[PDB]
Amino acid sequence: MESADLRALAKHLYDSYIKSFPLTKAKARAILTGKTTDKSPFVIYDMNSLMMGEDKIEVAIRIFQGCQFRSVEAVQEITEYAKSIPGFVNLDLNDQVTLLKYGVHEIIYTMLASLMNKDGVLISEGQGFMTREFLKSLRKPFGDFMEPKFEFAVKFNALELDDSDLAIFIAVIILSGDRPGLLNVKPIEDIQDNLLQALELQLKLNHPESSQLFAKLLQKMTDLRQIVTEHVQLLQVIKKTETDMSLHPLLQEIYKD
Amino acid sequence: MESADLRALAKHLYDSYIKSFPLTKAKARAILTGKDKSPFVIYDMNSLMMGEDKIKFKHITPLSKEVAIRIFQGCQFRSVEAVQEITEYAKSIPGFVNLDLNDQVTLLKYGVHEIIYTMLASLMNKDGVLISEGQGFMTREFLKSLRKPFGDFMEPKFEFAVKFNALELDDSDLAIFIAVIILSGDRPGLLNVKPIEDIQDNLLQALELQLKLNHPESSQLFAKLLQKMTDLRQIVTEHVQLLQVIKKTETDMSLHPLLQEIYKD
Ligand SMILES: O=C(O)c1ccc(-c2nn(C(=O)c3c(Cl)cccc3C(F)(F)F)c3ccc(Cl)cc23)c(OCc2cccc3c2OCO3)c1
Ligand SMILES: O=C(O)c1ccc(-c2nn(C(=O)c3c(Cl)cccc3C(F)(F)F)c3ccc(Cl)cc23)c(OCc2cccc3c2OCO3)c1
């Protein structure tokens, strides 16, 4: 509840966010808008370019497993970031697990948007770019599993957040006192209140011409909760057809309840 | 013409050290020496069962049921919090945040073990260790008597602590010492050693002056303190080898994968 302390917290979370995540939104936007010369991605738009892409950098399964593997790495990255949020590690250890269990998916979607435009998504640390049309054209259940990520990303990216905004936003999501099964809601909400104050000041200073960006950003936490539910529900259905798939135990545990 | 600058740097680090760490050495010594508000003492299984039911130690609450495992992991979890505390303290060392971000991460990664040991001695005497911000006191004998490898994992910390505490450092000494450890130019993988050593050279100057003024009767205390970095590197190395033996033999260490992720380092 002090401006300079709120600014200090924003700088702390931004700095830690840079340390925890390999590919920032700033880097991803430089790659996506191009204009540069050797940060240029190889573009995978069909079966044959995928085959060529392996030498430079079932098709639907291999792409799914590529997402699963990246998602697991994201969980690791998010987990390392979470420990830097002031107060998180001091919480009851079961609550730490619970907050990560229910928060990682919402964060993955958020940060996935940083890697997307309307035409595709960066992969392999920005070295490749896989087109939305190719992903949507994958077979049976896999195509319609890829596309909702793009649907969200386009809407979310219209807010034009930069990384210093996202670092606080991601922190706010993690410290959600309403997660099922929390033992100690009060210290979680005390931390989130500081993060919320920090976010509000951040958005007012960094986006002063963007009216009610704070409220509009929080209304996006609504769209996240819905899409994680559809994702989980659709992911389970895929399990009932595809035994040539298996989830990483880290993800397997997260989805269990 | 920089005596006053070293005092300023000394005071700056002392003030910041007080803000970052929960239980100071000065406070911890009053408790250990008995100088009212007496900590709960854990000297065996039944007293542990009572203290976790009364005081509710956060690192020793069920989340394995085996007591020696639960105490081992409780140390791990407290070490995780200490890392964040040291990380926040590091940001206050003049020049640290201006270093290359990868080097900041590298220095913290390879220093936290040495610092946690150093600061653990503050909470220790020859008879046990303070826990939960001084609310509990777990005896050396109870820790040393734990089964299989866990007992022999606890006791080397006390052996180091007893020798380190004979230097009789206070918090104003330790604040500079901890900073010197952090700014180690020989950590593997550093990108830009020169500014790291430039800072350590200032911190070393401040530590030397601090020790002469604070311990004028303790000859070559500076040299003796730097010689303890030998004892630190050695035991951190031994510590790593002891953890791997525990990991490769103990089938009862399963935790939720998220928790394993938090504790990964
Ligand atoms: O770099 C990243 O930060 C990142 C993050 C997420 C994906 C990605 N996951 N995903 C999932 O379903 C998913 C999600 Cl959201 C959350 C949890 C578990 C899963 C799982 F388990 F079910 F997957 C996607 C679906 C579609 C798209 Cl477009 C991307 C993702 C990510 O994807 C990079 C990527 C995209 C296409 C092909 C790839 C690839 O990496 C290698 O090959 C990056
Ligand atoms: O409050 C503190 O400032 C503190 C600091 C350290 C410990 C503690 N770590 N530990 C380790 O092995 C260890 C060490 Cl040195 C360095 C790096 C990583 C580790 C790790 F990761 F491997 F742990 C100990 C071993 C024995 C003892 Cl005695 C204490 C420590 C500490 O421990 C307090 C504590 C907390 C909960 C249960 C306890 C307990 O002490 C006994 O039971 C506090």
Side-chain angles (χ1 to χ4, degrees), chain A residues 1-10 12-34 36-46 48-50 53-54 57-67 69-132 134-139 141-143 145-154 156-203 205-208 210 212-225 227-235 237-238 241-243 245-246 248-255 257, chain B residues 2-10 12-18 20-26 28-34 36 38-52 57-147 149-211 213-223 225-233 235-246 249-250 252-262:
Chain A
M1 263 216 90
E2 210 289 89
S3 315
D5 289 307
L6 294 171
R7 302 313 296 142
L9 182 62
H12 168 88
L13 298 171
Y14 180 49
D15 168 81
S16 147
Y17 171 102
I18 302 309
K19 294 169 173 178
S20 307
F21 300 105
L23 184 45
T24 68
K25 179 169 178 169
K27 176 156 172 177
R29 294 293 110 172
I31 293 166
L32 288 164
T33 70
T36 42
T37 36
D38 84 331
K39 328 199 174 92
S40 264
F42 186 93
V43 176
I44 301 164
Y45 59 102
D46 67 10
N48 285 254
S49 51
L50 178 67
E54 337 183 0
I57 283 145
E58 214 268 71
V59 73
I61 308 292
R62 288 210 290 148
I63 293 175
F64 185 100
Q65 301 292 166
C67 303
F69 147 89
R70 233 333 260 177
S71 278
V72 167
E73 256 169 12
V75 176
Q76 297 168 348
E77 281 149 34
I78 286 151
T79 301
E80 161 179 325
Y81 180 68
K83 311 193 303 180
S84 76
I85 305 171
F88 180 88
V89 286
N90 313 112
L91 299 171
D92 192 77
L93 274 46
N94 299 296
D95 282 351
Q96 288 179 41
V97 170
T98 293
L99 288 173
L100 282 173
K101 187 197 194 95
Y102 290 84
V104 288
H105 273 97
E106 291 169 20
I107 293 174
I108 287 172
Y109 266 83
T110 289
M111 296 191 77
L112 182 58
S114 301
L115 311 191
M116 289 178 144
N117 59 30
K118 92 206 176 272
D119 292 325
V121 57
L122 289 167
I123 65 165
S124 163
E125 264 205 278
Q127 284 170 273
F129 176 94
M130 191 157 306
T131 69
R132 183 182 185 169
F134 180 51
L135 278 154
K136 164 143 63 71
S137 90
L138 292 171
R139 61 132 175 126
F142 287 110
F145 178 73
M146 297 316 166
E147 169 74 358
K149 287 67 172 163
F150 289 103
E151 267 137 7
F152 166 72
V154 151
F156 190 82
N157 283 351
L159 301 189
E160 287 187 274
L161 309 179
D162 59 45
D163 293 296
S164 63
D165 302 317
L166 289 164
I168 321 181
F169 179 55
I170 292 293
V172 165
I173 297 175
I174 294 167
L175 278 304
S176 300
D178 60 304
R179 305 300 196 184
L182 283 175
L183 305 170
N184 259 312
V185 167
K186 191 33 147 75
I188 305 187
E189 290 195 318
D190 268 344
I191 296 168
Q192 203 196 44
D193 292 0
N194 262 272
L195 294 171
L196 284 168
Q197 290 178 65
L199 180 57
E200 189 183 17
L201 191 60
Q202 169 68 15
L203 292 179
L205 298 181
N206 194 33
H207 298 271
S210 189
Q212 295 298 297
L213 185 50
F214 187 57
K216 283 328 220 235
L217 188 39
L218 296 174
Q219 293 192 284
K220 280 310 208 293
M221 269 161 75
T222 278
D223 310 9
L224 280 173
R225 193 88 31 113
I227 187 159
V228 164
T229 291
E230 319 188 321
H231 165 92
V232 158
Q233 201 36 87
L234 161 51
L235 187 55
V237 152
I238 272 168
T241 310
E242 309 290 336
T243 38
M245 196 168 333
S246 50
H248 186 294
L250 202 30
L251 289 177
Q252 256 281 318
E253 199 61 72
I254 285 154
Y255 287 122
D257 289 280
Chain B
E2 46 171 349
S3 214
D5 298 309
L6 305 168
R7 301 312 294 151
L9 174 52
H12 174 85
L13 293 170
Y14 178 69
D15 296 340
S16 163
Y17 171 96
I18 299 297
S20 299
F21 298 102
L23 189 54
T24 61
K25 185 180 194 190
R29 291 291 109 174
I31 300 160
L32 287 159
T33 64
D36 160 68
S38 239
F40 189 100
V41 175
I42 307 181
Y43 57 83
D44 84 341
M45 299 298 138
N46 284 344
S47 40
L48 178 71
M49 207 160 149
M50 179 167 276
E52 61 171 284
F57 314 114
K58 250 311 310 148
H59 300 313
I60 307 168
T61 75
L63 310 92
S64 168
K65 317 294 285 171
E66 216 250 275
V67 170
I69 289 172
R70 283 178 60 254
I71 285 143
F72 171 54
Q73 300 183 316
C75 293
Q76 295 180 312
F77 305 134
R78 167 68 186 130
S79 284
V80 168
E81 297 184 295
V83 163
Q84 297 316 322
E85 291 156 17
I86 303 162
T87 298
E88 175 200 292
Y89 176 66
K91 313 308 164 79
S92 105
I93 298 161
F96 185 81
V97 299
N98 295 325
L99 298 167
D100 178 287
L101 267 44
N102 304 292
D103 280 358
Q104 290 178 44
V105 170
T106 295
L107 289 173
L108 288 171
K109 182 179 186 14
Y110 286 103
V112 281
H113 286 279
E114 292 163 21
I115 291 143
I116 294 174
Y117 266 91
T118 302
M119 296 187 78
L120 184 59
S122 286
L123 315 189
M124 280 188 165
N125 64 19
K126 68 206 198 321
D127 304 306
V129 54
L130 296 176
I131 69 176
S132 295
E133 299 187 13
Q135 285 192 320
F137 170 93
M138 185 164 307
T139 74
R140 182 169 183 178
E141 184 280 338
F142 176 60
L143 289 161
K144 164 156 162 65
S145 81
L146 287 170
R147 64 73 163 174
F150 293 111
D152 295 344
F153 184 77
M154 305 305 189
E155 177 65 10
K157 282 71 176 172
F158 288 101
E159 303 177 281
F160 165 79
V162 150
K163 309 208 289 233
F164 188 76
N165 288 347
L167 303 177
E168 290 183 273
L169 299 181
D170 62 39
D171 294 295
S172 76
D173 305 316
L174 285 163
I176 318 185
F177 181 62
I178 288 307
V180 166
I181 296 175
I182 290 168
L183 278 294
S184 287
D186 58 352
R187 307 297 192 194
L190 288 166
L191 295 177
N192 187 4
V193 173
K194 177 166 141 13
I196 298 168
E197 297 193 318
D198 296 333
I199 296 172
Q200 206 196 50
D201 284 14
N202 289 353
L203 298 170
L204 286 155
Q205 261 169 100
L207 177 64
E208 188 186 10
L209 178 57
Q210 166 68 14
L211 297 172
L213 299 171
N214 195 37
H215 306 272
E217 91 283 350
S218 184
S219 195
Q220 289 288 332
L221 182 55
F222 185 50
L225 187 47
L226 307 172
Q227 289 180 102
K228 248 63 182 63
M229 287 153 96
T230 291
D231 284 355
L232 278 174
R233 301 264 177 108
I235 192 170
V236 166
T237 279
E238 284 168 63
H239 173 87
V240 158
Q241 287 294 69
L242 287 150
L243 292 180
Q244 327 297 65
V245 173
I246 288 164
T249 72
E250 293 287 333
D252 205 350
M253 326 300 278
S254 173
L255 287 184
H256 193 299
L258 266 315
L259 255 180
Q260 270 153 5
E261 197 60 49
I262 301 167

